[PDB]
Amino acid sequence: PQEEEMIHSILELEETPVREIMTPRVEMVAIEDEATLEDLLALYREHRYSRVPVYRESVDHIVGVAYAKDLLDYYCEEDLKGRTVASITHPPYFVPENMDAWSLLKELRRRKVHMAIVVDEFGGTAGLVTLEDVIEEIVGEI
Amino acid sequence: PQEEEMIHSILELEETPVREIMTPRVEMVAIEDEATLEDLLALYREHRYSRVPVYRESVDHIVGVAYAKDLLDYYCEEDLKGRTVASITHPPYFVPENMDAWSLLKELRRRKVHMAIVVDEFGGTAGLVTLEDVIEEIVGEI
Ligand SMILES: Nc1ncnc2c1ncn2[C@@H]1O[C@H](COP(=O)(O)OP(=O)(O)OP(=O)(O)O)[C@@H](O)[C@H]1O
Ligand SMILES: Nc1ncnc2c1ncn2[C@@H]1O[C@H](COP(=O)(O)OP(=O)(O)OP(=O)(O)O)[C@@H](O)[C@H]1O
Ligand SMILES: [Mg+2]
Ligand SMILES: [Mg+2]
Numbered sequence: 369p370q371e372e373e374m375i376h377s378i379l380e381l382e383e384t385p386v387r388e389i390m391t392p393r394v395e396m397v398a399i400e401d402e403a404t405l406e407d408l409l410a411l412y413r414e415h416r417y418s419r420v421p422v423y424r425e426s427v428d429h430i431v432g433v434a435y436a437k438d439l440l441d442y443y444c445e446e447d448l449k450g451r452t453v454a455s456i457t458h459p460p461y462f463v464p465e466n467m468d469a470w471s472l473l474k475e476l477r478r479r480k481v482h483m484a485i486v487v488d489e490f491g492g493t494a495g496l497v498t499l500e501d502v503i504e505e506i507v508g509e510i
Numbered sequence: 511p512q513e514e515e516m517i518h519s520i521l522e523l524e525e526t527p528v529r530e531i532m533t534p535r536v537e538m539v540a541i542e543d544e545a546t547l548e549d550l551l552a553l554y555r556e557h558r559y560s561r562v563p564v565y566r567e568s569v570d571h572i573v574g575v576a577y578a579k580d581l582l583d584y585y586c587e588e589d590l591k592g593r594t595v596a597s598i599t600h601p602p603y604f605v606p607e608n609m610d611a612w613s614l615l616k617e618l619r620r621r622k623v624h625m626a627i628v629v630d631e632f633g634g635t636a637g638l639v640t641l642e643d644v645i646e647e648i649v650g651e652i
């Protein structure tokens with residue numbers, strides 16, 4: 369039926385490069401590690417992404433990922449200008465640009481992380497890829 | 511390989527009742543529609559769920575779902591005591607207790623919703639079920 373197309377999508381996950389499914393660098397919404405949490409709130413309000421990569425000087429040097437929801441732990445009274453994105457930043461999980469989607473889903477589940485940073489052949493940033501991107505190859509588009 | 515177990519999990523999704531995969535009512539974290547957004551912030555801080563069902567008088571009368579992230583649109587200056595959970599509540603998607611997981615994933619994708627409210631045979635609430643619960647039948651546990 370339509371069960372059939374998902375069967376083929378699973379056997380083909382070991383043959384799909386993560387570069388074929390990622391969100392490329394020029395479409396990433398990211399933030400500097402020295403930005404305040406108030407700037408993360410503003411960034412969230414504009415773009416509505418739950419997970420934001422964090423970089424030092426360029427989007428080509430990701431140093432981690434920040435969750436917009438972690439802002440909810442902080443009191444507007446003083447904390448938001450008083451802390452930087454680095455204070456809430458989780459360590460990044462990098463995957464090569466030619467890693468297959470099958471291996472990525474295995475490691476995303478094991479590592480208990482939802483977003484991976486995809487690096488290019490030369491040491492910079494090619495983009496990001498999330499569990500939803502991997503899911504949409506199996507299921508369709510969400 | 512291990513590709514094999516996911517093949518069986520997909521053909522069996524049409525034979526798995528949503529009651530077999532849901533989170534049951536007594537383990538739901540929910541909030542009253544007349545609670546302030548400050549109480550939703552407190553509820554989020556304690557339990558960390560992103561989506562919370564919303565009820566009138568009992569958890570057996572769900573009237574919608576609230577997103578913790580929608581609190582980030584509101585200014586601590588006055589809004590949080592000044593609004594109620596009802597002001598941010600999205601309409602609920604109810605599914606019967608014997609609906610198959612296959613049909614649920616089809617409708618969750620089409621409807622562009624992540625959480626469904628599972629109703630019991632007698633008109634009350636049996637629990638909730640999310641796209642992740644459906645995903646974990648295919649993939650494992652996340
Ligand atoms: N920071 C980001 N910048 C640009 N694109 C992103 C970012 N985060 C995710 N995406 C892309 O948006 C799509 C949706 O991803 P995902 O649902 O994981 O993010 P989200 O909707 O912010 O998270 P969640 O659904 O858990 O709230 C994916 O294709 C992903 O590649
Ligand atoms: N409000 C809730 N109360 C109790 N259990 C819930 C609630 N929301 C989700 N769950 C359960 O927790 C598990 C994780 O679900 P899910 O990842 O969709 O929620 P979440 O982690 O809060 O959302 P997100 O990952 O998008 O931030 C699922 O098994 C789901 O049934
Ligand atoms: Mg998508
Ligand atoms: Mg989404």
Ligand SMILES: [Mg+2]
Pocket residue numbers: 642646651652
């Ligand atoms: Mg889970």
Ligand SMILES: [Mg+2]
Pocket residue numbers: none
């Ligand atoms: Mg989760």
